[PDB]
């Protein structure tokens, strides 16, 4: 059970740390019980969540994931 998420997290603190200023827009797969804290961490930075999509998993199935 994996999700395909596109998201965008600006740190808002690169100007006082002088970091690499790398890209903040990604399309990644995340597993089932992991997307929970990923959701939460992306919302911690005020990040926009563009689109959540099912990669792996049939919904409504109970045994066998």
């Amino acid at each position: 059970r994996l999700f395909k998420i596109t998201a965008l997290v600006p740190s808002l603190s690169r100007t006082r740390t002088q970091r690499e200023l790398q890209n903040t827009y990604f399309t990644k797969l995340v597993p089932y019980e992991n997307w929970f804290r990923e959701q939460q961490r992306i919302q911690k930075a005020g990040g926009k969540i563009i689109k959540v999509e099912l990669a792996t998993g049939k919904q409504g199935t109970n045994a066998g994931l």
């Binding site: 997290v9 603190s13 690499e20 890209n23 990644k28 797969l29 992991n34």
Partner: protein, 246 residues
């Protein structure tokens, strides 16, 4: 500006950072040329296992390279799927006690050593209730990871030139950033951090390696060299040890 309780906030001046050994910082970018992906993959191997597992032993997961080269899973996902793996467990989770496993997984993922006593208390509770995959998930997802490596930057060491350093863990972090770090086997961080609040120990004043065993023959000391177990505490000159008196 660290986002926590017990960690302190520091500032390194901008002059000091420029005059230091700069390190290559391998971002993924999933479109560049054929070698420039393998360089990033070799860097992930060189930093996560402290020596490159291929070209040296030639055994690695060839399943996950075929997804990182494409762009199915990002680097923050790849480090996570590489740590909770059967390959990493045979070298770093199986030899060491859990309190040493925590510090080595701090070096492999966060690229630093434990900053406070509260840090190792919380992360020991997490590895305790959930094995190694819970520790890997709680480490890769953090604020200190995502502010530093984002989604794509391969993790990298941060000594005394890259970022500002604190005094309190300076000694143990100096020995953690080494090739000879996964041989101590004795947790250098929880022992020092909880010896800070407590008074002195009963060890010999000239280091802990001076205390012989007492089994009728002696001539036996913990070598400084065989397995480190280094714990020097500052004794004064008017001390007196406490003795049991048979």
């Amino acid at each position: 500006q660290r986002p926590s309780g017990d960690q302190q906030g520091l500032q390194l001046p901008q002059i000091y950072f420029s005059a230091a050994e700069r390190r290559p910082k391998f971002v993924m970018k999933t479109g560049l040329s054929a070698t420039e992906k393998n360089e990033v993959i070799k860097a992930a191997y060189r930093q996560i296992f402290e020596r490159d597992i291929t070209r040296a032993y030639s055994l690695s997961i060839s399943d996950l390279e075929s997804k990182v080269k494409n762009g199915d899973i990002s680097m923050k996902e790849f480090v996570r799927r590489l740590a909770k793996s059967p390959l990493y467990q045979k070298q770093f989770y199986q030899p060491f006690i859990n309190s040493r496993v925590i510090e080595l997984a701090f070096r492999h993922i966060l690229g630093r050593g434990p900053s406070s006593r509260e840090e190792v208390q919380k992360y020991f509770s997490i590895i305790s209730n959930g094995g190694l995959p819970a520790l890997v998930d709680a480490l890769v997802d953090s604020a200190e990871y995502s502010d530093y490596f984002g989604e794509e930057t391969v993790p990298y060491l941060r000594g005394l030139g890259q970022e500002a350093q604190e005094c309190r863990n300076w000694g143990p972090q100096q020995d953690l950033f080494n090739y000879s770090a996964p041989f101590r086997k004795v947790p250098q961080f929880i022992t020092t951090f909880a010896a800070y609040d407590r008074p002195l120990p009963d060890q010999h004043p000239y280091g802990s390696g001076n205390d012989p065993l007492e089994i009728q023959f002696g001539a036996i000391f913990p070598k400084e060299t065989r397995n480190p177990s280094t714990s020097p505490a500052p004794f004064g000159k008017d001390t007196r040890r406490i003795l049991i008196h048979q």
